[PDB]
Amino acid sequence: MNYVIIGGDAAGMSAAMQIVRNDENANVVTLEKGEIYSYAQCGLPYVISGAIASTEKLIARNVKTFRDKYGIDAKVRHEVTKVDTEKKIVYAEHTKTKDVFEFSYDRLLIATGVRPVMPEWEGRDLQGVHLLKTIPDAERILKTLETNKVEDVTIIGGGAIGLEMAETFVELGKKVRMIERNDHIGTIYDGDMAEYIYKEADKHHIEILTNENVKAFKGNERVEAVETDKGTYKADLVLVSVGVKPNTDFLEGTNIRTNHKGAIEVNAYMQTNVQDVYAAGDCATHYHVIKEIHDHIPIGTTANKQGRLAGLNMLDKRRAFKGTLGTGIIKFMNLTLARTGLNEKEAKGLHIPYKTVKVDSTNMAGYYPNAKPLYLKLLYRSDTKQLLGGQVIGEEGVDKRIDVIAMALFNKMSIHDLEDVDLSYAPPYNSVWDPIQQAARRAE
Amino acid sequence: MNYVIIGGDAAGMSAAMQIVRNDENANVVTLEKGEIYSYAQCGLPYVISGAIASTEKLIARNVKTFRDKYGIDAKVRHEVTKVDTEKKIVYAEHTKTKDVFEFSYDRLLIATGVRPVMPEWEGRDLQGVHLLKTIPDAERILKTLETNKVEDVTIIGGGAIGLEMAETFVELGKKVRMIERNDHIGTIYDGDMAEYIYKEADKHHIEILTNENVKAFKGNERVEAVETDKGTYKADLVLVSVGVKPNTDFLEGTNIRTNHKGAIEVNAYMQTNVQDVYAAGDCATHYHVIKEIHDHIPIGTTANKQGRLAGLNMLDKRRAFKGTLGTGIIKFMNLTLARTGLNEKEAKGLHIPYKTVKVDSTNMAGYYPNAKPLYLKLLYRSDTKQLLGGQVIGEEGVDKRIDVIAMALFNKMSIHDLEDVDLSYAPPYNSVWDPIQQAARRAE
Ligand SMILES: Cc1cc2nc3c(=O)[nH]c(=O)nc-3n(C[C@H](O)[C@H](O)[C@H](O)COP(=O)(O)OP(=O)(O)OC[C@H]3O[C@@H](n4cnc5c(N)ncnc54)[C@H](O)[C@@H]3O)c2cc1C
Ligand SMILES: Cc1cc2nc3c(=O)[nH]c(=O)nc-3n(C[C@H](O)[C@H](O)[C@H](O)COP(=O)(O)OP(=O)(O)OC[C@H]3O[C@@H](n4cnc5c(N)ncnc54)[C@H](O)[C@@H]3O)c2cc1C
Ligand SMILES: *SCCNC(=O)CCNC(=O)[C@H](O)C(C)(C)COP(=O)(O)OP(=O)(O)OC[C@H]1O[C@@H](n2cnc3c(N)ncnc32)[C@H](O)[C@@H]1OP(=O)(O)O
Ligand SMILES: *SCCNC(=O)CCNC(=O)[C@H](O)C(C)(C)COP(=O)(O)OP(=O)(O)OC[C@H]1O[C@@H](n2cnc3c(N)ncnc32)[C@H](O)[C@@H]1OP(=O)(O)O
Fold it and tell me: What are the binding positions for NAD(+) in this chain (chains A, B) (predicted)?
């Protein structure tokens, strides 16, 4: 009857909705540190670029809707500072008044996500130095752009967010530099596929600095330069996007098990090792279909799936989480960048014997107008030929190909079985053999 | 050592290539009625519309390449009139001289495709009345357009070719009418999905006449009108696209088994019931993954797959054809029309107990600019919830969704398992739950 959920976004409220729909008697309390529930963090770079009208558009469901329509006791400005798992009590501090409130639970869900990491650099706190995670973060970036005169923007780190924001700043007419860490080389894309990204950045005059370490941010009250071990470069706005940390700090003192980075370990049913305590989303570990290990790939698709499953399992409607594939997709300038399953760094790390096939092809029939190049790479087990992963890069039809690859991986297909699938074809959409199938044929 | 292939296009030459690559000794003779090998019939409507420069662009590999590079004895203007399966002799007529040649075989492949059907209507042979199958057919259509004043075009029959050519004729600035057949209502799309097609045609001023029967084409030397049981309408060019017949006539008296429509029955290995005689592509039957029966769905993807498999199996490199899903995709004006697996008429026809889910959705996040409506319908088994088929209609992301559905059908997935797949998402490509997954969730 008493369900408590910590975190009022994707994982937390996906759970809440399951509970509310499948238990009419349920008393659901949700505890959110901020003032905004159920919003799309994914849309933030597109609000900042002006492509979306306002952050208001990103809100999927109101706290007022959660309260009035669904009868969920949704709290705002409630930061949980500790949980007593023996007494089954959650302790929340109001972020403004600092008053402490107790919430007893029969079942608890931790859905606190991750936070972006700001390393302890001199200049950390300078005006115009930004992280991007929340709606307030986006507004503050917009406020820097609106007041302060911004010509040069430096992005620290890459990955999805760094790349998307490099585009956003280019589209806002800025001169964009990216400074890239060595610790993230090959983590998403293999070297040969990443070449297409460097080429596209160069093409749009996004300066990318490799093997260069941030030393400090310089300026008065506002930032005006980035200092590295190799130089000092003008910057009127710095976005730091170098890594994330699970928001699980507050659970020190409980016996709740955590991986090395602090992500909460969950079994098939979203349960921690502590009785009646569940976790879901970016704050939790993610069973990997191919790795067969509990990984951490904090993404919004997985968070909704895990959150929905946490709610269901909290209701004893037993259903197992099938896993992540490490699927990810990025819009970067004119390119679409997609990956799923294992890349070479991942395969090597697991000591899985693998081979690769790469094809430079097109998204559709070469004779059809506006046919575009399509770069597609697959990994497969050298013994069983089990498909292990794929990377697709091009202007069009990249999402289609990665979803097909994802489906293949989910079903544990052999690479050559792809040849046998009746995939769709007409000249404006594909070639008579899909690029995936052409690559499959090249495999041993 | 002696391999003979009848038909010099997709199925026949996919086979020849397999044989040539996997047997160095092989003497391959290919017998082709026309003068053009290995061309994309699929691109024909796009040459006629002007989108593709010329028919030459559709040729994937020519007879000179087959002869000089691959050592295939590729014959043109050779029409096979007779096969003696006991003596293992193929009899061919030269189409010009009418001289008779004979070809001895160890293994034979029939890859003769289908032909468009011209019903026995008065006016059949009037100038401006056209079938569309071959490059010469397209040139003849272009010739009618170049030398005559065409303003009104009438198309007999819907289907993929009918709809594509309706587009082509609208794009050429013509007033287009199409007169649809009642026998083919619900064969591709369910009634509720077909509504979207009728709406889009109406929007572009394509007159569609329902339950109306053609009785004659009228005119002096050329067509000037089409007469039906309900009226007589002006037409300067008539395209008849009402069905196809397997080119298997010539095999009468061989004991080669054939279905009711004349398509050659093949087993898993592309073998007919007659020793050392194979068949593949449009002239052959197509084992259906979902129907679990030998169907006939003649398209170019299946033709290449079957032709490739026939060559391999002719070399005793034993490999089973996994089947068709009945996948099909059409560009129609602003819409993309995709279907795969079973529709309602097919499910009912088989007495497979089924339910449906239909979702009016978008191709991506609703808040993202240029997000477009997406209409998606799924069929699934009442008892096991096994996915049975899908129909998707919309402006963008239709091909992606049908290929995902195709993959699911190939793997015999239950509808709710789709909820678990780590499909890709970023705002420019999808919603955080794919439309297929949202439909899956509505299912019982
Ligand atoms: C710029 C950006 C772009 C992205 N793009 C994509 C994309 O294209 N595709 C994709 O799949 N994913 C994307 N993501 C990731 C996606 O936004 C997240 O994976 C998803 O929001 C995770 O949901 P969650 O509920 O686990 O965590 P969150 O959405 O982070 O929610 C956790 C909530 O818990 C609250 N909280 C934390 N600690 C406490 C506490 N102690 N007490 C009370 N409340 C607390 C926080 O205020 C927060 O609201 C993107 C993320 C960012 C930042
Ligand atoms: C307008 C149009 C659009 C199409 N669009 C698509 C599409 O978008 N997607 C798709 O998948 N498919 C499409 N198709 C279908 C695709 O073109 C065919 O399925 C494919 O060409 C079939 O290959 P095949 O080798 O079995 O037969 P064919 O390609 O028809 O080749 C058979 C050959 O056999 C020869 N032949 C016949 N009889 C004899 C004989 N007695 N002796 C010697 N030779 C003989 C013929 O001359 C012919 O060249 C389209 C077809 C048309 C007409
Ligand atoms: S950066 C991307 C990550 N961020 C976000 O997703 C944004 C924050 N999102 C959330 O917090 C959740 O995604 C919310 C908005 C809470 C989703 O809540 P719900 O789970 O209630 O989602 P829906 O409102 O879409 O409801 C889903 C269930 O309702 C059934 N259903 C929907 N529509 C219909 C119709 N028309 N007819 C019948 N049923 C319908 C669905 O089947 C679904 O049922 P389940 O039982 O939940 O599968
Ligand atoms: S309307 C659409 C239907 N119409 C048509 O398809 C047009 C007519 N088409 C055809 O007749 C055939 O599709 C043709 C053009 C004959 C294709 O013949 P091939 O089967 O020879 O096709 P490829 O030339 O692509 O060769 C395929 C085999 O070669 C291997 N391969 C290609 N490229 C490479 C590279 N770079 N490196 C290694 N191997 C390569 C493929 O793996 C493939 O091998 P298989 O053993 O056949 O799988």
Answer: 160-161, 164, 180-182, 243, 298, 329
User: Encoding tokens for residue B335?
Assistant: 């819409």
CATH 3.30.390.30 occupies which residues in chain B? Answer: 335-444
Contacts of B429 in chain A (CB under 8 A): 329, 331, 336, 399
Stretch (H or E) spanning B278: strand B277-279
What is the residue type of B367? Y
Q: What is the helix (H) or strand (E) element at residue B196, kind and residue range?
A: helix B191-203
Q: Cβ(A315)–Cβ(A309) under 8 Å?
A: no
Separation of alpha carbons A236 and B81, rounded Å: 80
DSSP assignments along A260-295, one per residue: TTSPBP--TTSB-SSTTEEE-GGGB-EEBTTT-SEE
Sheet with B27-31: list strands edge to edge. Answer: B73-75, B27-31, B2-6, B107-110, B277-279
Considering only the top CATH level, what class is A41-58+114-244? alpha beta
Q: Fold for B335-444, please state it.
A: Enolase-like; domain 1 (3.30.390)
A194: helix, coil or strand?
helix
CATH architecture of A1-33+60-113+246-327: 3-Layer(bba) Sandwich (3.50)
Q: Which residue has the tokens 């071959």?
A: B134
Q: Which two tokens stand for residue B60?
A: 């994937």
For A426, residues 6+ apart whose C-beta sits below 8 A from its C-beta are B42, B160, B329, B330, B331
DSSP B3-43: EEEE--SHHHHHHHHHHHHH-SS-EEEEE-SSS--SB-GGG
Cα of A443 vs centre of ligand 4, distance in Å, is 14
Which atom of ligand 4 is found nearest the CA of A442? Answer: 42
Q: What is the largest CA-CA distance in chain B?
A: 70
This entry's atomic model was obtained through X-ray
Query: How remote is the C-alpha of A115 from its chain's centroid?
Result: 11
User: In DSSP terms, which residues pair with A338 in a beta bridge?
Assistant: A329, A392
CA–CA dist B71, A212 (Å, integer): 57
For residues A128 and A120, what is the distance between their CA atoms, to the nearest angstrom? 16
CB-hemisphere CA count at 13 Å for A209? 19
Closest CA to B6 of B304, B307, B296: B307
Residue of A nearest to B56 (CA): A367
3-state secondary structure B391-404: EEEECCCHHHHHHH
Which chain B residue's Cα is nearest to A418? B407
Question: Using CA positions, which residue lies closest to atom 48 of ligand 3?
Answer: B441
Residues 6+ apart with CB under 8 A from A250: A80, A81, A82, A83, A112
Closest C-alpha among A346, A351, A281 to residue A311: A281
Q: What is the DSSP string of A10-36?
A: HHHHHHHHHHHHH-TT-EEEEE-SSS-
* Separation CA B398–CA B393 (nearest Å): 6
Q: Resolution in A, one decimal?
A: 2.3
Region label for B71, one of left (φ > 0), alpha (ψ between -120 and 50) or beta (otherwise):
left
Quote the CA–CA distance of A217 and A214 in Å, as a whole number.
8
In chain A, CATH 3.50.50.60 covers 1-33+60-113+246-327, 41-58+114-244
CA distance B361 to B23: 52
Q: Which long-range contacts (CB under 8 A, 24 or more apart) does B265-272 make?
A: B265/B294, B266/B294, B266/B306, B266/B321, B268/B320, B268/B321, B269/B309, B269/B313, B269/B318, B269/B319, B269/B320, B269/B321, B270/B306, B270/B309, B270/B310, B270/B313, B270/B314, B270/B321, B271/B313, B272/B110
Where does A288-372 show beta strands of DSSP type E? 294-295, 328-332, 335-341, 354-362
The answer on whether B11 is annotated among ligand-binding residues is yes
How far is A365 from A198, CA to CA, in rounded Å?
Answer: 27
Instruction: Look up residue A84 and give its amino acid.
Output: D
Q: How far apart are CA A281 and CA A114, in angstroms?
A: 9
Distance CA B8, CA B34 (A): 9
